[model samples]
Target: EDLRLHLLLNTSVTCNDGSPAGYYLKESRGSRRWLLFLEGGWYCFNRENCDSRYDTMRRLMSSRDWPRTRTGTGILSSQPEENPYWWNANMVFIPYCSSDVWSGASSKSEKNEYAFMGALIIQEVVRELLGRGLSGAKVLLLAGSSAGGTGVLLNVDRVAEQLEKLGYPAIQVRGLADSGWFLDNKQYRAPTEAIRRGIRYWNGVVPERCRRQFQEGEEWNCFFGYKVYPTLRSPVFVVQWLFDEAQLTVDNVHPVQEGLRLYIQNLGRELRHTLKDVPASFAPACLSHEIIIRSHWTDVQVKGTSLPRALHCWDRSLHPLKGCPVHLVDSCPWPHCNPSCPT
Candidate 1:
């Protein structure tokens, strides 16, 4: 089947009640299976950045540079004005706390509100797609990076159930989270400290009200527990680099790793057998915080000799020698690397 690209934008607006109410829609494409790409924190959830990211992927796909074989295409002319790379796939970008949710109040309630907003946006997009005659079977994937990755990992189950209830095809959601912050009960200590430090830093900048919100209760609860893990029905591809600048500290790194491991363990056998670990150098410096987003175009190769087809790749800088079970040879299909595996 031919592939087409679609671009969607998410924006926030004030409703009549003076409350923040908005919607996210596919601004460009008709109706088809979607490859929802969730953006990371603090970026504008508008058309410009979303399109730019898509265009970047398109440019790479059309270029001779980078890894193209994995994508099943060689170099090509610039993408046509109408039939862009993301055209056939319904590309939905959902907006989260970056706007009102995290702007004024950083409280757990506010964060949960932001998460709910995202879930609502996904539901609306799915409904709109089906209304436009796009079958559930065609909705291809749901992926995110960093904060966005947390959203995918935490909320995928609800999205899948909603799709199934609507009589749509079983949503074959494929998740790709780069340097995701997978927080759980076990990962509380480090993440809590990170939150405290982050709050302290923000306190220096924002108002007292905002600082209080972030400090109230278990802040990470917004993205943890059975609620987040149970909903993941699709194969998940997670790529995290050691020495991540944003999470470079021991406190940040250890907690996130433990949280992710907990999430994977919770999935048990229900988790799809497909997993890939890729080297960290493949991740760009600027996009370091939002590593999951980088997976969209990262060059990944499966280590053929690995026992399991699934390969985990870790940057040599992070794992000097092979040790950690999560760290292994890079293997799996494109975009799946086991970066955490020891060298």
Candidate 2:
């Protein structure tokens, strides 16, 4: 029971359908600072897709028998890690339960469900954290991958706003959006159906919020990083791979192996365009998607500079290796990655 990270069901919390939500947390000693990491498994907005996605996040998957427990590692690592960044910090891992990148706000539909209230879930959790231990945090960082990354970008500022109003005004907040800047490209684009359903399902609140800030017509476009990052009020770092596997798979983008080299160059440029120098970001040229994991983090180097070294440089406002941006990782030497091994 002590080893397994049992499910901390947001049992008291409800999804848009009023179904229970769940999460897992591990607190560290002497640390008022914290990290809230959201787990990503993608999302589904339409009725058919949402139910199909109900089982997508194991932590919040089914009420049937999910124990909702896990050992800490990676970004959630305890201590003495190969790369212990936030290991000493209080950590909370929230499983993505909403099918809307954790940004939806609708409550329920006549058919028994509206879009999952991911935004609502966040408000409740942050409020809960205030009561439990976060009120004392001197620093709080929000991080996530893929859908989780998208959720981070979606809610980071809103979360900070809530914290301030809820009485944690002095705490410093930061965010990292990883592999979630996935966008519909000039070449093969993602279907409009998914975006449409997500917007309508989330009840247009998210996009409306965005339109007011971004002044854009298409609300769905605001969800994409290129548009969202510009208006974010908080400082958020972005880490992404040039060739994201999921985008090619889910977004159905096909780049010829013969044209792959050229494809990545164009993709990287597009990604950098989104960076805009507002947030501290790292866009590595590689086939992999995320970097906040274990095996992939050891004495690792890209273009001859190690990852840890780069992060340290950022930490002390020190300099990165010659000819490199201080915060971004460059030329990820091993261009490929294994998806199953890290967790």
Candidate 3:
């Protein structure tokens, strides 16, 4: 069927500016497989930041001007030539309009002037989809890039549990978190006072077990991907760039510092270490930020296996003992060292 955008006006979910939130849906005939993508964008933490964000990028904070249609690309692409594995699956694209990194759970109030219901919106989307064929889904891959990928880390298990609670215990819920494996280093750290304060402002909710690990006022630690990743119970496929541009820029590393050799090496090591225990992951020692959404996503590779190949292996294995090299990472020390680095 043709792709369409459906708004959730009947639900309590709303964007940061109280506009109704929605998602893009493209259904496949007689297909029980599904892929739900959460669109990625940066977020605001406080009043002034959010105020300017809404003023400058209302499309991210409010969906008042959203279009009636959207075409999927990369992993959401409908073309078999582009998306080999999931091309025929039912697809959904959820725009990132809450500005909370898809982690907030609070509603709008006169005092706050905005809603921070990102987490709730994911749940609400699933609830709405249940009536529209998702109830019979054999597998549901909740995937996202950047902050939306971070949202996958924060919400995949929750989604699985919610499905079980809703009587769909047979559905296999998995996560494809692209470029969201953020790490803390000498330059940048999570649980920063900014994030701590933003948690209160956004009423953010982290994984419950991770939240319990920290004491009062320290729950913001769970905001970091690594911090909460260990607590995730569901299966997830992580795609990350070792020298992520966004991570470096946020950490304020100078762009021309000796080609950032030392920092790049350190970031690579940290990511390698952070992802050591993950079974289904693809980490390339590259300098870009995100890829799974780009047209060239299938071109980049880690140790000669493209992301699509690794994802296909993972998908089939889940549906094994050796697992066909799904946990792939570039062992080279520098960016562009790999032959598959995108031109």
Candidate 4:
């Protein structure tokens, strides 16, 4: 009953089907902490894929099936017993209906059948939220999972820049990217290829610094988290499974054993390699996908420290405190080795 859908009054920004875009809001009285969670879904790389996607997963491309009210879960939960660190913070869940992995900037037009305005939607939402108490926010955490997790990486710095441009530079902006980090692995290169093709199809927008690192046609490299992470101006905490299910699936590894043993092992090593310079992260040797929104998210841990615990310590470290371990990665060599994993 606490979470209610608020449609964006601006009609210019919309979902793929030109439907009004919106977000679910759960205000924490007068609390100044804000968490804007972007929902994740598989992305389509081209017109054919998007057309096929809309015909099948309409909810991901349109908001016609959105519920009037929703109950927050996982990190979005208001119960302190469930979410100890951020239970009292204002929570906003933005649905994924743009099918552009939340990075597109183009609007609907005669030549285009879908409105790829995901990046613009975030901008407009922030604008609308300003009047809805966001102006008083001391901190805004941009968080998401899977595709939306990538969205956080692509938009956090951009959002901070936007706020700075708008003259409200005091509000701290950060990111909690879950299961969105991908490796530039040789065997698992489909996602990168898809992004390369989708960048033009979706009119994608990458962070300025990262975009400048690549040639005009190769700006799609910025879509990869590891490639663009160094150029990110805002602080980001990554949460990833060493043996991510999506990557495994994309590589056609069934996890049934032997034939894909080396690949799986290298996946963990590569994740650790790419994450070595990341200031704060939680990488468990698990074979799962997204966890931040799961009921068992609090149970999983790395080096005996749970994700929530790491996040809390990371939060404190950012709030001018010190002496807490924030980089919690598993030393285990195999997947499902963690006893805390959901069975």
Best-to-worst order by lDDT is 4, 3, 2, 1
lDDT of each: 0.36, 0.64, 0.85, 0.87
Off by over 4 Å in 2: 1-12, 55-64, 109-115, 189-192, 204-209, 213-217, 254-261, 276-279, 303-325, 329-343
TM values, all candidates? 0.45, 0.83, 0.95, 0.96
Error of 4 at 63 (Å): 1.4
Global CA lDDT of candidate 3, please?
Answer: 0.85
| 78-106 per-residue lDDT for model 2 (tens digits) | 66555555557777777666666777777
The sequence of per-residue lDDT tens digits that candidate 3 reaches over residues 1-343 is 2469899955579999888888889988699999999888878898899999988889999888989998888888889888876888999999999988888988788687899989989999999999899998999999999989988988898899999999999999999999777865667323266677888889988888887898688877776777887888888898998878878877776444654667678778888888888888898888888888786689887877888889899987886536367999777878778778776
Task: Give Cα distance to truth, residue 33, candidate 2, Å.
Answer: 1.5
Give the alpha carbon lDDT tens digit for every residue of 1-343 in model 4: 5689988999878999899899999998779999999999979988899999989899888888889888888899998878876989999999998888888998879998888888998998898999899999999999999999999999999899989999899999999999998876767327778888888888989889988889699887887789988999888999999888887877767624664677788888888888888879999888889988775688887878888889999988887334467998887778888777656
Which 10 successive residues of model 2 have the least lDDT summed? 333-342
Give the winner by TM-score: 4
Q: So what's the TM-score on candidate 1?
A: 0.45
> Clashing residue pairs, candidate 3?
none
